[PDB]
Amino acid sequence: MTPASYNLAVRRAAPAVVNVYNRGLNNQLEIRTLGSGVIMDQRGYIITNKHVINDADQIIVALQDGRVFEALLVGSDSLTDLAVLKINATGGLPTIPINARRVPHIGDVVLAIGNPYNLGQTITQGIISATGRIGLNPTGRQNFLQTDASINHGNSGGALVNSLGELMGINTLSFDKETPEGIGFAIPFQLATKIMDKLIRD
Amino acid sequence: MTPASYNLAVRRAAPAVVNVYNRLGSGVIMDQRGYIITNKHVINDADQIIVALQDGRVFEALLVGSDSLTDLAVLKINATGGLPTIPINARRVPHIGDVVLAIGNPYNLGQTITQGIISATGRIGLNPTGRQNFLQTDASINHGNSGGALVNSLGELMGINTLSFDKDGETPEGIGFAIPFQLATKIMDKLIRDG
Amino acid sequence: MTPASYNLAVRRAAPAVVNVYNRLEIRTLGSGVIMDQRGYIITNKHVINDADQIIVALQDGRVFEALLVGSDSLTDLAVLKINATGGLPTIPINARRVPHIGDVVLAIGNPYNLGQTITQGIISATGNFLQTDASINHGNSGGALVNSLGELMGINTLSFDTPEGIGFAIPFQLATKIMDKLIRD
């Protein structure tokens, strides 16, 4: 027989999730913070976390296949805390699966993909805990997704995908206010997307 | 292709799980008449107990009685409309390993669903739990989940979530407990036919 | 209908996972996995390190004193021996199966002495150390990490020093190799 697995999602998305690093002058340069990013398309556009690349002397993007790029910050967005990078790839880029017709449902099994404590790309699984909106009017457009898929420093900017490897959101920061568990957030993919397209227009 | 999901169990059980506050734990609308279960410590020495359903309705609830030997309490609300109730299959045998979902109101963030499995069904002899019939789960439990529901992939009530374990040396992960539904169904009827 | 479950995995593997005590009193605790019927159990070295007496307890209630037969500094794995008055349950092993990231996996050990507990996660990474998010806590060391078929994927070790859902395991291949090396003596 075959083991229960969410390996089909891991194979379709893991390759498009890169390791992001923020290096700054101390000569002598070092890593201020590190996060993750999702290669959106073969033009070299990546979506990451704004707090991960803020005040960066050098932005280093590292794919899973060994390739290391020096990236360019195209622009970030405050309301959602997203930032968009750009790399110059010539050998072909692995991209994240996207299904624009899909609508995320509470309970859907979801996988978080990121670089917790720089231990190297890790995959954690949970479900979509809730979906809401932060801002004026609770009935407004969905702003965030909540998941219990373990999130840690280094996951910021990463991808939230369902069991078909489809993009559901861009992991953000976790929750902290005793010592909470299984509470993490992401920006819906339909929103992450619309912002990128905007930003890619300067 | 269809995405793997537990949304079914959710649509079935979440409507029946309420937000408890006073003038903030959680609760489960056991049956039509308006009987709501919760933990006795959730409502202990509280003033006006307020109960908010996921459909936005809000009611005042009266403590129809709690039970110290199980840390459970039963509340009553007089609703005019129809009420949502938690699915309950009395012929179901909870097994260790069954996928389970915890529904509650963590840090008053709004109703959330967390998934884990049934870690244990009970315990033999002295133990950190202090009890024998506790259902142990690794589905994320936080302050506010107390009193909420523990359901399986069909939305059936497995137990009533209880106080979080946040320890004697370091912060534990994936350790939560729930009171068996079979025990809550007993304690409900008793506190009911007892006034 | 029937609830989605990983009980099959529990039934197959859990009987073989034991609770290891380091005594005297209790200086520390962990878990172990019965590699074969005669009573050979694998656990981690740090759990039974410097023990006046090694107590092993089966999930069925029986309690046996253990003999530290040997260990391996390299992988931090130790081997214990107990004499059961009959054949003992063994952890399922399938040397032909290749662990994949994303594979559902269960953690079986004795967290905070609560008693045997099963937590679930997935293989988060395979980069000779396996990484999983199946909740691991103090007392889980030396325990079993199995997939949905009860097959052994690894011996859980010590967690990540607050980080959430980061735990590692020593590949079952290594445990198998280390068990044969010590039984042969």
Swiss-Prot record, chain A:
Consequence recorded when altering S156A: Does not restore RseA degradation in a degS disruption. Loss of RseA degradation
EC class name: hydrolase
Domain of life the protein comes from: Bacteria
Documented effect of changing Y117A: Loss of peptidase activity. Binds activator peptides
EC number: 3.4.21.107
Annotated effect of mutating H153A: Behaves like wild-type
Record flagged with keyword Phosphoprotein: no
Subcellular location: Cell inner membrane
Membrane topology: Single-pass membrane protein
Substitution effect: R133A: Causes substantial reduction of peptidase activity
GO molecular function, one term: serine-type peptidase activity
Active site per the UniProt annotation: H51 (charge relay system), D81 (charge relay system), S156 (charge relay system)
Catalytic reactions on record: Acts on substrates that are at least partially unfolded. The cleavage site P1 residue is normally between a pair of hydrophobic residues, such as Val-|-Val
Keyword terms: Cell inner membrane, Cell membrane, Hydrolase, Membrane, Protease, Serine protease, Transmembrane, Transmembrane helix
Impact when changing D77A: Causes substantial reduction of peptidase activity. Binds activator peptides
GO cellular component: outer membrane-bounded periplasmic space; plasma membrane
GO biological process: cellular response to misfolded protein; proteolysis
Effect of disrupting the coding gene: Small, slowly growing colonies. 5-fold decrease in basal sigma-E (RpoE) activity, loss of regular growth regulation of sigma-E. No proteolysis of full-length RseA.
Effect the entry attributes to changing Y117F: Loss of 60% of peptidase activity
Subunit structure: Homotrimer.
Function: A site-1 protease (S1P) that cleaves the peptide bond between 'Val-148' and 'Ser-149' in RseA. Part of a regulated intramembrane proteolysis (RIP) cascade. When heat shock or other environmental stresses disrupt protein folding in the periplasm, DegS senses the accumulation of unassembled outer membrane porins (OMP) and then initiates RseA (anti sigma-E factor) degradation by cleaving its periplasmic domain, making it a substrate for subsequent cleavage by RseP.
Entry text on domains: The PDZ domain probably binds peptides ending with C-terminal Tyr-X-Phe sequences, which activates proteolysis. In the absence of OMP peptides the PDZ domain inhibits peptidase activity.
Entry similarity comment: Belongs to the peptidase S1C family.
Miscellaneous information on this protein: Regulated intramembrane proteolysis (RIP) occurs when an extracytoplasmic signal triggers a concerted proteolytic cascade to transmit information and elicit cellular responses. A membrane-spanning regulatory substrate protein is first cut extracytoplasmically (site-1 protease, S1P, this enzyme), then within the membrane itself (site-2 protease, S2P), while cytoplasmic proteases finish degrading the regulatory protein, liberating the effector protein.
Protein name: Serine endoprotease DegS
Species of origin: Escherichia coli (strain K12)
